[PDB]
Amino acid sequence: APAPFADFAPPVRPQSTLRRAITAAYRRPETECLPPLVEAATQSKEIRDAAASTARKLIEALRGKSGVEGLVQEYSLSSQEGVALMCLAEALLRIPDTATRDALIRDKIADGNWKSHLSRSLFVNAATWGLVVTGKLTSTVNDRSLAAALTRLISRCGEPVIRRGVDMAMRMMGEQFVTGETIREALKRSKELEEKGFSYSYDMLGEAATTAADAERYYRDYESAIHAIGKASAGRGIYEGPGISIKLSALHPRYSRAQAARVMGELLPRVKALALLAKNYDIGLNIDAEEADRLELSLDLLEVLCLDGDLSGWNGMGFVVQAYGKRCPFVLDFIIDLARRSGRRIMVRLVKGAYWDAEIKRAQLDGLADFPVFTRKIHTDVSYIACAAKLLAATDVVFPQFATHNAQTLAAIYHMAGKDFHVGKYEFQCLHGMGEPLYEEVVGRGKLDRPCRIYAPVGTHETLLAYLVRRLLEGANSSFVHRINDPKVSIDELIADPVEVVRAMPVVGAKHDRIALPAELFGDARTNSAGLDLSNEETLASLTEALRESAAMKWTALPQLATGPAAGETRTVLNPGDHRDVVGSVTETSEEDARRAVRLAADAAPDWAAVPPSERAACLDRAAELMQARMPTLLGLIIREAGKSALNAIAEVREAIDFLRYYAEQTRRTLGPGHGPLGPIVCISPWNFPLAIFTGQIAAALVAGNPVLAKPAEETPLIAAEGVRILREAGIPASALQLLPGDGRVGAALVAAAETAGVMFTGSTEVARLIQAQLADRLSPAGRPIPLIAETGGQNAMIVDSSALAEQVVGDVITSAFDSAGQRCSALRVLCLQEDVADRILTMLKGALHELHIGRTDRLSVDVGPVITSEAKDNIEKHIERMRGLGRKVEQIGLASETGVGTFVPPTIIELEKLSDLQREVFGPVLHVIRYRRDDLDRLVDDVNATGYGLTFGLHTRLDETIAHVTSRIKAGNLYINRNIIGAVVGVQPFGGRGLSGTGPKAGGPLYLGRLVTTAPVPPQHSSVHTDPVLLDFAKWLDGKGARAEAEAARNAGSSSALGLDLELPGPVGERNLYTLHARGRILLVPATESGLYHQLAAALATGNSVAIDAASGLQASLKNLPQTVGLRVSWSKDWAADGPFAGALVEGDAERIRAVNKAIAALPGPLLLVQAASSGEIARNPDAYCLNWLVEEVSASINTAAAGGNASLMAIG
Amino acid sequence: PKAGGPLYLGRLVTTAPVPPQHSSVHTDPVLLDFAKWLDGKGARAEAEAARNAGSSSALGLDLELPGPVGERNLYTLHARGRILLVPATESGLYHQLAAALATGNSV
Amino acid sequence: ELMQARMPTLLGLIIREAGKSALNAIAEVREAIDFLRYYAEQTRRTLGPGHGPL
């Protein structure tokens, strides 16, 4: 039985002083990085003047010397027409036979009806063509605008414009974006510039392997290219002759620090084999630099390769360092030292860096201390020049390669390097089809007589467009190449010296004013929770120790009553991934003590209510600080108790911290003396988010002024007990927060207790239904229903069309379906693939599935942990076997023998014939896949809605028409576009569904606290200027009927309603997070009087709903002669169970009528209904007798606006 | 169509062009339900025409037009209202319904 | 272009024939100029051989 965390994340090798200096700089504050860079980049006044003169000369030559622009001009194309034309040209070039393409153009395309002859939107890559035509990036494509534009331009200009577009696109995609379609073509085309003194480095365009098969394909592409390049090099050697550039992410599908052992065992030999071939031909082999979290891992490969005697005698190994990265100079120190130790003259390509916007987004998403890159472009420029000075001092041991298109950067380095030059000392580098105009002013004895190596992409149209967006942005407003073409930018501006500009700033190295540090995403509202960087060796080393220390602790969970811990039945809590690992001990609550706890809560309710809201919120904020400080220990407990990986656990603790701070801030924004607490609230929580949901429900109830009976799931009491201990330490009195560990009997005893004033339940729909039935017999002392928030299961779908990028889909599917072994309520259950792409995506998905590591979660390398119990395992496996027995195709990972000591289900993909193959939620790592024809998309959305669930939903498409269609027709609480579907960032994706998935209001949203007080406050930003038109028609009808007071109440409800609220919530860059209030659906109205009916109808119509009115009320004659608009929304129901599902109910009557109606409502099939009841007198006295907060439905939509490959808004940030 | 607007010239030719900026990403939901109904009854050509009408309709276009500062000049396309349909054949009726529903109208 | 250049003379006629003030006569001529230029531009954006006249 292996000791917990004994092998959590050991480094590849002990970290040397040089390696530790790299890690120390990972997220160093920008103000600390810059001063040494300024010093190192400083040059004499004579050199600065000479450099500016050289830069001006180069820039004057550049400006003194278009294809798409000329086409746009000749045919008077709008921007959309230009984009549409290039998309058409791209599609026409997918026709191989040139004569067949020309015949289609002349006979069919030119005569209109291009739609008839061209499963895949023509405009799939329009975001890329948009960048080409307009210089602006859009994440998604307005395909209807492009279709209109294409029709218009073809009808106006005919075949000649199509011909010109085809020839333009052929030239760009075959000769500009790539040096050649194949390595042989690229080599033939390289002779011209090689004869002028250029060299080449070829890039076979491999990147981000998703499967073993992809990695093998990219391997054989590199190997075949090395042969072709080496044959062509013909002994020219590594400096004069061509080389190759490779990306490590192309060569293994799990290239990450978490998988370091697989990287060293499996990726390293592949690089070695390629390097051995490059050695034999004596060509350069350069390792390109990728994301910041791969930098230090790549150094371990570089170290092994440079120390491997089989590669000795060859100096062609190359390595890129990114000057936008804070570690760059320390990486260079490490590399220079490695070159000295190994005796290999490492080729070092200095670049600025290609992943800037992605690094900003990632650090914000992960809540990390700072960015691993600079945030002002001028800082990167200074870093580059400082790093060039370091490289130029070490030309005896490394070969510097200065990759840049910036004439100022170039000139600074040209003069820094001095007049002594020989081929092999250093070189410049540029990108094919971008840098030649500059470097034709550099290469050759008649220029600066310095060599330049051209980075030459090689590949087909399909491969080229995959990452052209990122490549073009390298096009942003701050980019030299964009600025050189901007007439408003003077040469003096372009030759400005970044070193002297930085040195003269008030605070040297200050962060960009318009980029939030991750902690500051929410500004003054609250402090973002902080995560942990699992790529940082210092963090991993410290976390290893804290995790081991957590496993030595004697964790317990006890019934913590107001009067002290109570005795009870005690049992061990076992690690679900290894039952031999005892995590702690739980003492469970007797049903007698549960009832006693509620009475103690009732007695303590006035004292807790009297704590001012701001002080209650201060307790939550203190608890959040305590949880943040204790995060490493909390991670260890969550990892061992609940089967979570470290990443799962970090998310869990961050979410708890965010709930605490969010509900604290919402309280400070809203709660006053008139928002009285309900009283004792029973908080019943699920095992699968054993700290986050647990803490969220309790914190909300407490801060609203209610004492809480906290009943954690029987599977996960220890982390709940620790959360209670933390809240109590933060100042929540023991009488206000009692912990009652135990199973559903303890929950049921709490729900049934006489003084229970509200229930917050998160768990399965079936259990929520039992609670709903229990509460249907109950009324408050005021004779009103006991509020129930019941957040329940999902049957969550993702729809993927033929415009989505398969690699992006597969990553988001693997994460959404199998993160936490599918034990997220948000997990993807049903993937819906458009038929034309289904086979390709499914193949990639199955390949990615088999790269997952399943096991006990106290290892960083484990992706997928166990299921929580043997009963959960048996239930999941029974479902899989039923599917397999029906003949459905089932793909499963093979599990290691070590899983036998725990309860594991392998990640599973099941191919369904119809969505009806699924019944209820299967809460495990089981992804179902269905295929759909594009024309059946609307029926498919109906089918998704027809399950009755409505929790999370994903859509992967680039096409605005499809986004608009799908998102308007889907009925789910949390929508995600071009990303995973498991996001629940508090206050950013307020989380919670509808139908079988929830009553609402959403946790982590602004309506939540208002449900926990007797009179709901007005939430921040909660209003709408829109008035429902059917409400208005009803108000006029009421006036025409003479119901004057009711017409006024109807108008007031129309104004009070927040239906139509449409907000963007602050969050990370590269995402848009939207929050909207819609109608709930059909509200069941159970009136008693005519006026009550009119008030109920006004409330429901003002919130956009339709209604079914109880026909047994006998009030049909009160609704004669309705306007058709209102009549369309009104039905009369004699059999309520036949006319559902409803989305809520409004009831009028005395206490016993309300109770009887509540029992009938609870008995209706399907979703739990949020019922509001009032007496006739309350309707007369209180305009808010029916609260409109609970008659609208919250919808959160999270859109990944970086999905096209770049961030448009950040293109203006430099 | 409005004088001084982008639909005007198209009324003065026998086949209307696609005006500048004339498109919408919105699809009328009743149109979509009608297309599904046509699908169900095997009216494949009409269902296709209905989906095509749903896409080519510019119902929901909502543009800000260039003009002077200190003013916002908006141009939007709404349903006309109730369209009188005078069909002769079942297929003609389905096509007329598709056209009218795709543009947000009742009939 | 001709209406723009001749606007002062056109104003005189509009003022006397149609009871317009100078400002409203200016608006009248400007609107005619704008129709001409707008329909010209809309034509350049749209009309091709398949859009036959009535």
Ligand SMILES: Cc1cc2nc3c(=O)[nH]c(=O)nc-3n(C[C@H](O)[C@H](O)[C@H](O)COP(=O)(O)OP(=O)(O)OC[C@H]3O[C@@H](n4cnc5c(N)ncnc54)[C@H](O)[C@@H]3O)c2cc1C
């Ligand atoms: C031959 C060659 C090989 C390359 N290999 C790689 C590689 O392996 N890995 C890699 O990551 N990229 C690589 N690049 C790209 C390089 O990193 C740059 O993205 C690109 O060349 C633009 O830099 P520039 O100096 O030519 O132009 P510039 O316009 O001078 O610099 C633009 C760069 O500034 C940086 N930047 C922009 N905005 C900000 C900001 N707000 N804060 C901080 N920094 C900012 C970015 O790095 C951006 O690319 C390569 C480029 C070339 C020409």
Ligand SMILES: NC(=O)c1ccc[n+]([C@@H]2O[C@H](COP(=O)([O-])OP(=O)(O)OC[C@H]3O[C@@H](n4cnc5c(N)ncnc54)[C@H](O)[C@@H]3O)[C@@H](O)[C@H]2O)c1
């Ligand atoms: N909508 C959401 O936000 C959300 C979030 C997380 C989990 N969930 C759902 O939670 C479920 C998984 O959690 P789980 O397995 O712990 O759920 P569950 O329904 O098994 O148990 C939930 C809680 O209810 C208690 N309970 C069981 N029977 C009870 C009864 N008769 N009366 C009162 N309480 C009773 C349990 O002890 C536990 O505390 C999944 O269905 C998942 O989709 C929903």
Ligand SMILES: OCc1ccc2[nH]ccc2c1
């Ligand atoms: O990550 C590798 C990479 C990224 C961006 C680039 N641009 C030009 C070459 C190049 C290489």
Ligand SMILES: [Mg+2]
């Ligand atoms: Mg259970």
